[PDB]
Design a protein around this ligand. Structure first.
Ligand SMILES: CS(=O)(=O)N[C@H]1CCOC2(CCCC2)C1
Length: 185
């Protein structure tokens, strides 16, 4: 891929964060805290899962960013509609306004309904995410493996502004405390 030149500087939106998340001062890193982080509730916060949105909204053009997932056991990454459900239980699917991949229990899967098995030979430490709004494309790249393609959602029906989407995952195991980090341009 030669998508690097559409690089955008993403920052995390604290107001959307689940109340257990800790976002760094520079708004470029997020991790699971071991308790509630002492913020008020609001209608934007994801209540059931350790999720947060980027501050940026995209309604046109080509955008690219990279996320560090080093030593995590579980996470979700991609984009979503600005209008996605925040409260209660839901599945990550294009029908619900999400275009995502994840790691869970030693397998990588794309968030289709039902989910799609991914074929990754080199476990990634950094993921590249490419959005072409007009084309209806979301693609994922393995930066650890020389940028190899992981997955392409095509024929996407965005149906609204898009936001960068993050899930740091649960830490029931004690092996998933590490942060998601937005990597420098
Ligand atoms: C991931 S964890 O460290 O096992 N603790 C979680 C237990 C379930 O509730 C939460 C999930 C998000 C809201 C609060 C914390």
């Amino acid at each position: 891929h030669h998508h690097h030149h559409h690089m955008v500087h993403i920052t995390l939106d604290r107001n959307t964060a689940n109340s257990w998340l800790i976002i760094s001062k520079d708004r470029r890193q997020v991790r699971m805290g071991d308790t509630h982080q002492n913020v008020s509730d609001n209608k934007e916060r994801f209540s059931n899962y350790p999720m947060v949105l980027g501050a940026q909204r995209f309604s046109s053009g080509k955008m690219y960013w990279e996320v560090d997932v080093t030593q995590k056991e579980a996470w979700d990454l991609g984009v979503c509609r600005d209008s996605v459900q925040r409260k209660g239980q839901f599945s990550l699917s294009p029908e619900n306004g999400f275009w995502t991949i994840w790691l869970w229990q030693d397998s990588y899967e794309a968030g289709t309904s039902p989910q799609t098995t991914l074929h990754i030979q080199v476990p990634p430490c950094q993921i590249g995410i490419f959005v072409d709004y007009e084309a209806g494309v979301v693609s994922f790249y393995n930066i650890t493996d020389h940028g190899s393609l992981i997955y392409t959602f095509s024929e996407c029906v965005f149906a609204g502004p898009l936001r960068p989407f993050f899930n740091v995952g649960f830490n029931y195991s004690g092996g998933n405390a590490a942060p998601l980090k937005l990597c420098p341009l």
